Amino acid sequence: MAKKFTKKGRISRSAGRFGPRYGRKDRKLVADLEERMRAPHVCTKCARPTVERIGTGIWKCSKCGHTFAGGTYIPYTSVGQTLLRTMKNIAEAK
Amino acid sequence: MGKRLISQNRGRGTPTYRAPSHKYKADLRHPRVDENSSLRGEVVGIEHDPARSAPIAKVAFENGEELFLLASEGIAVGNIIECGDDAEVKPGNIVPIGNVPEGFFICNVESKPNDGGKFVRSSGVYATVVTHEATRTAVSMPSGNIKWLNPKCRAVVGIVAGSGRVDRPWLKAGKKYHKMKTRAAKYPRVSAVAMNPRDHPFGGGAWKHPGKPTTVSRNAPPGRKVGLIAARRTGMKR
Amino acid sequence: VDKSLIKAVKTGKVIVGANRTIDAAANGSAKMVVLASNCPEDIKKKIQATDIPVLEYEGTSVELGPVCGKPFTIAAMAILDVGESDILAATA
RNA sequence: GACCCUCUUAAGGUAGCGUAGUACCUUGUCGCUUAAUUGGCGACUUGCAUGAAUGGAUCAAUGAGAGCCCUACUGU
RNA sequence: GUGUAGACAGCAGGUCGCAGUGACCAGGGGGCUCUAACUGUCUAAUACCAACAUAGGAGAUUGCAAACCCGUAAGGGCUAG
RNA sequence: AAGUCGGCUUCACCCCGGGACCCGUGAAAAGGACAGCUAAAUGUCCGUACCGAGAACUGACACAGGUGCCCCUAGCUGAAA
RNA sequence: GUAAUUCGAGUACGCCGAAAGGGAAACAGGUUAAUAUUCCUGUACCAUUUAGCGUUUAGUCUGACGUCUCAGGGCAAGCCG
Ligand SMILES: [Mg+2]
Ligand SMILES: [Mg+2]
Ligand SMILES: [Mg+2]
Ligand SMILES: [Mg+2]
Ligand SMILES: [Mg+2]
Ligand SMILES: [Zn+2]
Numbered sequence: 001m002a003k004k005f006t007k008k009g010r011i012s013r014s015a016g017r018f019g020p021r022y023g024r025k026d027r028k029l030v031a032d033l034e035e036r037m038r039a040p041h042v043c044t045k046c047a048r049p050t051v052e053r054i055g056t057g058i059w060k061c062s063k064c065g066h067t068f069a070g071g072t073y074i075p076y077t078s079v080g081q082t083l084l085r086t087m088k089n090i091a092e093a094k
Numbered sequence: 095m096g097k098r099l100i101s102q103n104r105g106r107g108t109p110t111y112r113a114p115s116h117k118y119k120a121d122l123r124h125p126r127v128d129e130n131s132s133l134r135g136e137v138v139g140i141e142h143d144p145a146r147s148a149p150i151a152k153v154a155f156e157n158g159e160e161l162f163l164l165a166s167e168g169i170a171v172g173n174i175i176e177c178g179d180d181a182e183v184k185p186g187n188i189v190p191i192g193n194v195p196e197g198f199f200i201c202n203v204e205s206k207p208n209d210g211g212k213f214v215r216s217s218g219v220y221a222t223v224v225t226h227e228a229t230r231t232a233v234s235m236p237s238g239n240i241k242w243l244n245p246k247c248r249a250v251v252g253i254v255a256g257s258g259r260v261d262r263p264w265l266k267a268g269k270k271y272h273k274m275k276t277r278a279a280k281y282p283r284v285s286a287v288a289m290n291p292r293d294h295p296f297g298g299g300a301w302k303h304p305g306k307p308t309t310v311s312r313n314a315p316p317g318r319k320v321g322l323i324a325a326r327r328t329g330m331k332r
Numbered sequence: 333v334d335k336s337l338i339k340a341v342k343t344g345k346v347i348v349g350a351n352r353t354i355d356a357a358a359n360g361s362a363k364m365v366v367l368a369s370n371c372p373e374d375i376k377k378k379i380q381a382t383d384i385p386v387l388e389y390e391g392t393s394v395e396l397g398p399v400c401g402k403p404f405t406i407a408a409m410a411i412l413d414v415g416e417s418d419i420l421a422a423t424a
Numbered sequence: 425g426a427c428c429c430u431c432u433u434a435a436g437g438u439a440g441c442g443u444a445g446u447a448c449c450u451u452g453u454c455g456c457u458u459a460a461u462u463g464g465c466g467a468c469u470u471g472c473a474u475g476a477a478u479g480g481a482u483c484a485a486u487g488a489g490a491g492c493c494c495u496a497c498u499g500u
Numbered sequence: 501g502u503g504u505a506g507a508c509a510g511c512a513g514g515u516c517g518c519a520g521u522g523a524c525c526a527g528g529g530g531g532c533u534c535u536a537a538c539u540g541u542c543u544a545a546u547a548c549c550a551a552c553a554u555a556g557g558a559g560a561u562u563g564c565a566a567a568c569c570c571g572u573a574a575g576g577g578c579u580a581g
Numbered sequence: 582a583a584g585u586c587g588g589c590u591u592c593a594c595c596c597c598g599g600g601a602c603c604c605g606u607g608a609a610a611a612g613g614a615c616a617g618c619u620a621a622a623u624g625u626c627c628g629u630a631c632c633g634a635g636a637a638c639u640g641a642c643a644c645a646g647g648u649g650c651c652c653c654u655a656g657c658u659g660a661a662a
Numbered sequence: 663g664u665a666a667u668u669c670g671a672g673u674a675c676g677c678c679g680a681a682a683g684g685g686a687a688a689c690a691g692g693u694u695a696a697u698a699u700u701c702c703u704g705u706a707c708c709a710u711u712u713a714g715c716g717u718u719u720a721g722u723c724u725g726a727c728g729u730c731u732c733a734g735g736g737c738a739a740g741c742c743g
Contacts, residue, residue: 020485022265047394055142057149057256068170069149069255077257080167105569107577121580267554272605322560
């Protein structure tokens with residue numbers, strides 16, 4: 001499907017561009033964060049996966065055109081999720 | 095006179111320690127509103143601010159003047175903001191902290207009324223309203239302390255955007271170098287024990303050791319408060 | 333509301349898409365027009381201007397699509413003639 | 425050279441490493457490396473005067489860094 | 501043979517010399533240790549190193565009319581934070 | 582003195598468009614465009630030679646250094662300046 | 663403000679700061695011992711004022727922008743018959 005994931009070429013992932021440098025821990029952290037960033041995120045108006053990162057904390061929908069501010073590396077954060085959940089439950093209880 | 099230290103050089107304000115002000119987009123402050131007024135406005139664009147490494151919003155108000163604003167998370171181009179006393183509680187509006195319910199998150203809080211906002215401004219931080227007495231309200235600051243603010247203070251509801259900025263390690267001197275070009279900080283910094291006895295209280299010797307205790311009292315004169323300034327404790331937790 | 337659409341797509345006249353629904357509504361042959369919840373507000377102007385009954389759909393167009401039999405997304409759909417279906421009974 | 429005692433003017437070195445870039449005695453003793461080695465490596469070690477962010481041990485890739493050995497090469 | 505082309509790749513036979521990247525150009529290689537992780541900086545004119553820097557780890561002060569600092573003062577740096 | 586024609590290629594130059602990257606986000610103002618057309622008149626001031634370097638600069642020199650390799654360069658061999 | 667200034671930070675109003683940033687408009691040939699998009703021949707172009715003949719949309723666009731990588735078109739140089 002993607003590039004050759006041979007018997008070896010499978011652990012580094014996107015951190016394979018650093019070669020033999022910076023140690024195992026940092027490379028693993030950067031790699032995992034990169035697979036989270038490259039994910040197919042979902043829109044809020046469209047409800048179609050079209051969201052990609054334009055800048056530091058700026059996101060946009062390719063089809064929908066919608067622009068919004070979010071996380072630096074991921075569109076939606078857990079704390080914002082909790083705020084939405086709590087405020088929406090309070091509103092809906094009224 | 096053994097040479098002055100880096101802190102005193104920053105005090106003088108030489109060009110090496112001055113912020114490159116012309117790079118920054120604009121100052122962030124709350125809209126100025128007279129007594130018993132409520133102005134609205136809808137976002138026109140979302141923009142990057144080089145002075146904080148976080149997004150900011152451009153909003154055009156009904157009078158005509160547009161202002162950059164500290165962008166809370168979720169702000170999108172098109173939504174209208176209703177800053178004023180009569181605003182409802184929603185993510186984005188600016189309302190007094192006296193009539194904010196307990197448990198709600200806020201940010202860009204002011205010290206005294208009509209300051210524009212001074213607390214809770216870096217990426218992904220937020221504060222909480224705890225209690226509402228008649229004369230004050232206690233909010234838990236992101237540091238972890240309780241602060242007693244005036245009920246007639248303004249603060250945008252939500253949390254500051256850009257959350258998670260420090261989950262990505264530098265892993266190079268080059269990337270951190272590039273960040274420091276748009277700040278007043280100096281990069282890189284020499285360590286005190288590697289200097290000469292003219293330059294620092296810790297310098298000198300045939301081997302690199304502090305020589306004297308690193309904890310310094312709070313009453314030490316300028317040019318000597320180097321190290322652990324008036325520490326209450328030291329070491330990790332055993 | 334949900335099982336009637338199965339027969340509306342199986343039998344009778346239906347058209348999928350915003351523009352053909354606009355044409356059917358203006359022509360008036362479309363007895364009823366069905367819309368998804370999160371559709372753009374630019375479409376509701378015609379659906380109110382058109383006398384045709386406006387059947388809401390609680391879901392979003394993204395899941396409206398697959399239930400209608402099409403993998404893609406459906407914003408506004410019209411049924412010109414029901415035939416062997418009773419979605420109109422849901423609307424009128 | 426244990427362990428009961430000590431000298432305990434606060435306590436008396438845990439993991440590790442160890443003749444070290446730190447070992448005065450000293451060219452310390454044994455093995456591999458040479459016809460022959462105050463050398464290099466490995467082992468022991470009663471450590472004049474090792475030791476845990478005065479950071480300990482080890483470490484792939486990198487080095488106009490510092491030692492020793494093999495092969496090819498040569499007027500050294 | 502591929503290709504729109506420029507060109508590129510491959511084959512069969514013959515043949516010369518001591519020698520066919522024939523001149524020019526153009527890595528010697530391997531093994532065992534100590535040391536610094538690495539790329540970087542350094543005594544312009546005797547010291548390019550194991551020294552300095554670095555990412556990583558930890559500690560301390562401060563809720564902003566703050567901590568730290570410059571000025572005799574008026575006022576300022578950090579701070580469009 | 583001929584002064585007619587075809588073909589191949591084309592950078593290191595011009596136009597146009599796409600993609601990726603950023604805990605870097607990559608100037609401002611004068612000026613110009615959108616209502617101009619015709620006619621005559623006006624367009625002041627300063628520089629302009631020559632060198633720009635193994636002899637015109639700087640190092641006391643007609644100095645093997647430095648400023649300037651700052652910007653450009655034909656045929657063959659060859660990946661190639 | 664300072665004992666005081668020719669000294670000192672800030673604020674308001676001005677004004678300067680790029681012969682490699684922005685930028686209204688010209689090319690070929692000839693002529694001298696030494697100057698040439700400057701002089702001469704030919705063919706052009708752009709502004710400000712005056713007079714005549716008409717008119718705004720007046721708020722937007724442009725000037726006006728990073729590093730890397732790639733397709734397409736064109737062309738000076740080059741080569742072949
Ligand atoms: Mg001293
Ligand atoms: Mg020897
Ligand atoms: Mg090194
Ligand atoms: Mg060091
Ligand atoms: Mg000027
Ligand atoms: Zn969308």
